[PDB]
Amino acid sequence: LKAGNFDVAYQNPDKAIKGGNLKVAYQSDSPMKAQWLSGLSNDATFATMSGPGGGQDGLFFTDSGFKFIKGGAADVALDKESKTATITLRKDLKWSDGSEVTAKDYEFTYETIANPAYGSDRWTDSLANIVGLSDYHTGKAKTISGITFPDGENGKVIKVQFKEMKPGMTQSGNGYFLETVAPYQYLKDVAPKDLASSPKTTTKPLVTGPFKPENVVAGESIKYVPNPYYWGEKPKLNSITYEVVSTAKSVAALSSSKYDIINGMVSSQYKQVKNLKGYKVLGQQAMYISLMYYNLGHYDAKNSINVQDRKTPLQDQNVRQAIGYARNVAEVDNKFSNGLSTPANSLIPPIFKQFTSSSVKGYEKQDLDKANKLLDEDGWKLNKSTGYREKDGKELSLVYAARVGDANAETIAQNYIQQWKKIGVKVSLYNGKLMEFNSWVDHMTTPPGANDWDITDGSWSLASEPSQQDLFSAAAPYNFGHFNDSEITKDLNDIDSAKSENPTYRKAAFVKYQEDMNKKAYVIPTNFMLNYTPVNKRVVGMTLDYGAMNTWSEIGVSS
């Protein structure tokens, strides 16, 4: 497996010893916040650090494209005819204290999220599609009517009844049903308002993974040891230590071999890591998309609808396309990214092989000839005097709300401005400077939307069900440029239709959607990205493969 020029796996030529201690770190300039219950945990650092303990007790294995498969802690099966998901927990699925994982532990997850007394921030609208769950969430019902137990609460089976089936239900991260268990017998006497701060969900939890946390140092570290009651393969290692390391100390920590693996390192540090002897640097395709938006209307919050009613030359398809073809994204990436940013051809990242294709063509290749010709034939005629184009007497001038974030954000933005000058479009920064992130978010997400920018950039970390509805639908508040297009609406609906229960049909729907978005050019895909992980040469069985389900049990050391 490759990801760009990176290997996804470190094929160590040396055999693993029996035992050993692996030293892992996560790069963060903020402390971790330990919370072992998925529904109550809001810290991405700790979520990753919980991996050896079961990742906050996730149930389901997937393939390398995040589609559910059988063989994890539980299986899930969908029945269209009865509008039901059936979750079957393994017979020997146990908590780390030896107690059984049961149907009730799965239901209890729902309670931690849906009962406001626990204080979860993880309720979503998608959960309202489970029969009876809204009524539980608002306190109208004492129980969740759509969740039943064919073999009772202490059995191993749970059935979840939906109002409507959704084709994304075969993808992990879909949000229509949950994928974790919580130890009800361990936590049942803790007041809901005290659950998040209880020792029992922080320093002294029960877990289901191959390792259990023997010691948690608040904000800093976990000492993991083998979980005797793990259903699967006994781990090779005797222990794993997982610690937070600061950005400023990560490179030195590799130089001194303080950590075997550091996760979450940022793109800027890669050139300092590449050259380190003693490490193999692995790479993987990210669940990420960056894109350019054009401002085309406003958002009507009361009626939950985008209205594409802004006066702007960007209402012209030829203009939107030309501004995309003018950019030099590849050249930019080649200068600055160290192969960690690669030009996007479409809005769905290539890691989703079942939902996209490299055959889809967008704006990944600069084509200034085409950009110029598009503007010509649309009546935007160039000037002798000024280097800029005019139509019905008015100059083609646009405002670019570029933002802070990338290490060369200023330089990249200026480069694009200069490319746009080459096609006779005058582009200026919003208020003559890059926008701060929090300012940018406010500007883009406060209805009805501003009228004082034309072009902006956004970037998203996508869930493993890469839903486009909450980003680009006519009803979506995150449709930042506010386009509203009958063909795109059709395309979006088709992706989530009953016909898309068929994977080949769904792939075709995702592909059409991506083609149509590129042609219409309301938005322009910019970059995909790669993540990297340095790995000490003594580590055996390390891989970034998303389909690798047993890495914590398989991983070892050669000395």
Partner: peptide
Amino acid sequence: AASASA
């Protein structure tokens, strides 16, 4: 609610 700024 699935995807995040980042």
